[PDB]
Design a protein around this ligand. Structure first.
Ligand SMILES: *[C@@H]1O[C@H](CO)[C@@H](O)[C@H](O)[C@H]1NC(C)=O
Ligand SMILES: *[C@@H]1O[C@H](CO)[C@@H](O)[C@H](O)[C@H]1NC(C)=O
Length: 92
């Protein structure tokens, strides 16, 4: 049930991609986000489709449940589901 995702690439200039947009998923499809979070300050690394087989923490919402990771990651199902992404560590 995922055909398209929010696209973001902080390395767009060297990678020769758009900086942002809508990615069409081809290649079960998912969307994902990866980000840094230092003392509450969030920096997106990438957003887009995720095509390899994977399991996510929530079906609908993009959520990271690992505890204090250096690079945060989430995946989700549903068109544009990765526009919102949250941190709910298992330790809570
Ligand atoms: C990149 O932006 C172009 C328009 O300039 C659009 O046609 C394309 O689908 C976009 N792709 C991504 C992955 O954002
Ligand atoms: C970022 O880290 C702060 C704590 O320093 C936490 O309250 C917040 O949930 C985190 N947000 C994301 C999107 O990772």
């Amino acid at each position: 049930e995922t055909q398209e995702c929010l696209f973001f690439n902080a390395n767009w200039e060297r990678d020769r991609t758009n900086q942002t947009g809508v990615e069409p998923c081809y290649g079960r499809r998912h969307c994902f986000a990866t980000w840094k979070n230092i003392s509450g300050s969030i920096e997106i690394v990438k957003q887009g489709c995720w095509l390899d087989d994977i399991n996510c923490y929530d079906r609908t919402d993009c959520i990271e449940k690992k505890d204090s990771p250096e690079v945060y990651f989430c995946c989700c199902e549903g068109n544009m589901c990765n526009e919102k992404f949250s941190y709910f560590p298992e330790m809570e």
